Each structure stands twice: as structure tokens, then as C-alpha cells.
Design a protein around this ligand. Structure first.
Ligand code: MN
Ligand code: MN
Lengths: 296, 289
């Protein structure tokens, strides 16, 4: 059984979430995310609480409930010159940060250094800060999927998701990405994404990233599908953030914004009978199914 | 005696520091500040440690000490959507922040709320963090001159400068601007700048801020003169930061950059016989072996 049936649809249904990550990271990213939601076919996004432009994104989110919004849990900071650290004070979560008090650049260093207790504390703090700013999140997911850097970290993530009664991103391709060879019979109580799509260097370098997105739309199969993008204007701010980091860098994010606000993308959606769904709808369906099961 | 005399110069000598504030505020401001030092006549600057682009500026400062660099002490955050707070944990300095954990927008809210012990801890922590990053500051000054919001805050500021054996920005006009009516007789142990120049909105709104800087250089007289500017490229980042805040806004900051990298401004230094000086030279005259 694939996730589309577990949500009430036929097997053949091409469920899709087009999800913008890293909202709150930069002003250019906030503006491109908002525009892709307003006009594009992007239909969900998640927010990086520890980030310098989180506040602006929060003001947008608390007053624009119609757009499916979640918390982009952040434990790593990958950029050369633009560095951020935890919501909580360094002294409370010392194993999460480098000598400058910023998150590590790599999941490897994080998994080698971080204590599961510090991870639970800081992730809970990020969600609590979002809630106190008036955000009503519909899901939680993970920047660079650092929650998979250790099995204990993923268990903390699952436990936090159940505590807040929120859906979360769990998927087998993302598991293999982070080397987390966890079994599949542990996830009986969870909804697993059948297919996660994201851009790759090998297509970007050959000028074919837009082509990859087009083909991905063209050949989407039945089940729950998730497209992860990072729309942002390729301006001075993003060039400064992504210096020496072409992978998911500023030109890449520009390509994301262009393709997923393009009439080509909408035409491919309608051509293929791909049905968009939000995390909010998924949470409502799971809530009603559990309410119905518990009484009966 | 003006400050040039106390520094060993004749009375008529025109000492000038051309000083970029708000470094570390933004990437556009970091880049305009660096370029105005390397290719313009700017010769000093100071860094906002709490700000989100502090690290980029710190890397530059630690590797390029030939440019006079100080700590722009920060206790207020004036911008609408770009918010920041203290280096220290909120529980340590709770009186310094609004309900979101950020600095208040105006000096007078700071004066209403802040305890001086919290101000002392937070300013000390900004200097200490700069030092940990390998910055070798030559002076300290104050964002929005909020050290002047209360006399006891200014006393903290003076004590901190003496503790680090660094000079600081003190000046009678700055005192008046922030409503501080201190009598000068308590500053015998201090070096006061004779004249502080900064842009004014009434010239900016005529399009004549550049002309204002030209007159400032033309009319400069003997003593210690400080020009305060905020060079930054007027790009999308700065428009996003300075939204609804045209006073020292993004267009204004671009004008700062363009004037102080121009042939006009350099020629004016020569024509007026203006002698540039840094805070480090002053520091070496005051604090001896
Ligand atoms: Mn991310
Ligand atoms: Mn300032």
C-alpha cells in the first residue's frame, strides 16, 4: 500500500507537494518564496527559525494562514561567510556548535559531536519560538535532513512530531541519502513519502536543472510525491550567502523560482493530472482517520 | 584648547577621521565599507557585533588590521523587519529586549527599561566576542549613541573604554542630540571630539546630501573632526532592511559610498589641507608604555 491509498485515493493518483525549503534564510529567499506561493504552483513551505530573516517570514506566515507552512528544523549551517547557531544559548546546547557558536557545516561533524539531549532541547525551542511568534505550523521537516545524522536523532524528531501532533517528512530515499540504513517495519505508525525529488549537481552543471524538473513532472507515478525546492532571487545577497557553494547556490535557487512560477510547470501539472495536496490536508485526513478508528 | 591642541597639534590643524559605522549590519554594507576603505578616503570603521553579517566583517578585520577598526556598541535595533538582539542570553540581560528577544527601536524605551548592570554585561560581551574572533579594535563607539540614553549608561561606556585602554566617541553635540545635559567639567580625564558631522534629512530630501558632504569638507576648521557615514550599496538587501526608514536608508547609504569614493572628495582633502588621523594614533598618544 502506497501513501496515496492510505490518504483515501486510488493507487494511480499522483499526489504532489511542491515544497519550498529554507524560508527565513535570506530576504531574497523570503521574497521569492512568497511570490512563488502567490503566483506559482508552489503550495507549501517551511521556515528556518534560527536564521537572520526568520522574523520577516514569521510576519508573513502569521497573517497568511491559507499557505501551508511548516518548521524547517535546523542543526547545521553550511555557508562560508553567513553563519548562524541555535535558538537556545550556547551554554545550554554546547555539543551542537563550533568554536564560534555556529552550527557545524556537515552532518558528519554534528553526528560525531552532538548529544541527543541537546538536539531535543534545541529542536523543541525552534518549534516553541515559531509558536510564540504566532505561526501555526502544519508540518515539520529537516534542513539537509540532519535529523537522519544518527538513529537517535531521527527518534527525537519522530517523538517531537508526535508531541505536537504534526506530520513530518519520512522517506526511504532521504534515509539512504544520509546513510541511515534503518529498517522499514519500525514505521508502521507513520506516513512515508513514496518519492522525493530534488535537483542535483550533475544536471545543474550541464544547464539541465529546469529539464530535470520538467521530466520529473512528466513521469510522476502514483503515490505521494514531494518536490523540494529553494526559490530565491540570484541577487547580491544570495551571491554573498552561497559564495563558493554552487550546489544549491544562488543561480540554482533562481532556476527553482523561474521554473516553478512558469506557465510550463502549470501546463505540465494539468497535462499529467497531477493533484496537489498540502501537509495541512494530510494532517486533517490522519486526524479524522484516527478519530474514527479510536471510537469504533 | 581644542582636541587637536591636546593631541600635540597647532590649534588650526584640521584633524579628520572619516568613519564608517554599522559594519556587520548587512552584506551590502560590508562590501561598500571594504571598498570605501580600499579605494576611497574612508580610513576608519566600527563593527556591530550582534548583527547577522558580523562574521564576514570580522574575517576582513582580522586579516586587514591596517584599517582602523572599532566596536560599534549596539543596544537598539531600529529596522522594521530585520531584527536583532544581544550576544548574551536573554535570561542574563532581560531588561534590554522587547517581548520577541530583540533590542528596542528607540533610545527612550531603552532608558525606560534597561538596568545598567545588564548594559555593562552586554557591551562587555560584544567587545569580548569581537576579541575572541581575533579582531584587534582600536576604539569603541555607540550605535544611535544609545550609551547616552541615561547618564549611568554613559558612565558604563566610559569605564569600559578605560578598562580596555581604548579611546571612545564623546562629544557635546552628541550629548545634546540624545537629551544628555551633562556638564563638561567631569570629562577632564577624557578626549572630546570638537565636531561630529553626519548627514541630515533636510539636505537628503532636496537631493543634496552629496553637496552637504562637500560643504562639510569645505568648511572644516581646526580641531578634531569626525565624519560618521554608513556606506552600503542600495540593492535589494538594503531596501529590505531600511523599509519605511528613509532617514539613513538605503539610497542615503549609497550616496555615502559614492561621495567618499569620488575624485571630488579626495581633491577636497588636498585643497583644504585636511590631515587624516585614526583612533589608533590617538590611542597611542593617550595610553603610554
Ligand atoms: Mn534546507
Ligand atoms: Mn550605527
Amino acid at each position: 500500500m502506497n501513501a496515496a491509498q492510505k490518504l483515501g485515493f486510488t493507487e494511480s493518483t499522483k499526489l504532489l507537494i511542491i515544497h519550498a525549503d529554507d524560508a527565513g534564510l535570506a530576504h531574497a529567499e523570503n521574497r521569492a518564496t512568497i511570490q512563488s506561493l502567490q503566483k506559482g504552483i508552489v503550495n507549501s513551505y517551511s521556515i528556518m527559525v534560527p536564521c537572520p530573516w526568520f522574523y520577516e517570514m514569521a510576519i508573513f506566515a502569521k497573517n497568511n494562514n491559507q499557505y501551508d507552512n511548516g518548521v524547517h528544523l535546523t542543526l547545521t549551517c553550511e555557508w562560508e561567510n553567513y553563519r548562524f547557531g541555535p535558538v537556545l544559548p550556547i551554554s545550554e546546547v554546547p555539543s551542537l556548535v563550533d568554536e564560534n557558536g555556529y552550527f557545524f557545516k556537515k552532518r558528519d561533524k554534528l553526528a560525531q559531536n552532538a548529544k541527543a539531549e541537546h538536539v531535543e532541547k534545541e529542536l523543541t525551542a525552534q518549534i516553541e519560538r515559531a509558536l510564540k511568534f504566532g505561526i501555526k505550523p502544519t508540518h515539520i521537516d529537516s534542513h539537509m535532513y540532519s535529523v537522519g545524522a544518527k538513529p537517535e536523532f531521527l527518534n527525537v524528531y519522530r517523538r517531537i512530531a508526535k508531541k505536537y501532533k504534526l506530520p513530518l517528512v519520512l522517506n526511504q530515499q532521504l534515509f539512504e541519502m544520509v546513510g541511515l540504513e534503518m529498517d522499514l517495519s519500525d514505521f508502521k505508525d507513520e506516513l512515508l513519502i513514496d518519492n522525493v525529488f530534488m535537483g542535483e549537481f550533475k544536471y545543474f552543471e550541464k544547464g539541465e536543472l529546469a529539464n530535470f524538473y520538467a521530466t520529473a513532472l512528466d513521469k510522476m507515478e502514483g503515490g505521494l510525491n514531494l518536490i523540494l525546492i529553494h526559490p530565491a532571487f540570484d541577487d547580491d545577497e544570495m551571491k554573498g550567502i552561497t559564495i563558493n557553494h554552487p550546489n544549491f547556490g544562488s543561480e540554482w535557487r533562481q532556476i527553482d523560482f523561474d521554473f516553478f512560477t512558469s506557465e510550463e510547470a502549470q501546463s505540465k501539472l494539468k497535462e499529467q493530472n497531477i493533484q496537489l495536496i498540502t501537509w495541512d490536508e494530510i494532517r486533517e485526513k490522519i486526524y479524522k482517520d484516527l478519530q474514527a478508528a479510536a471510537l469504533e
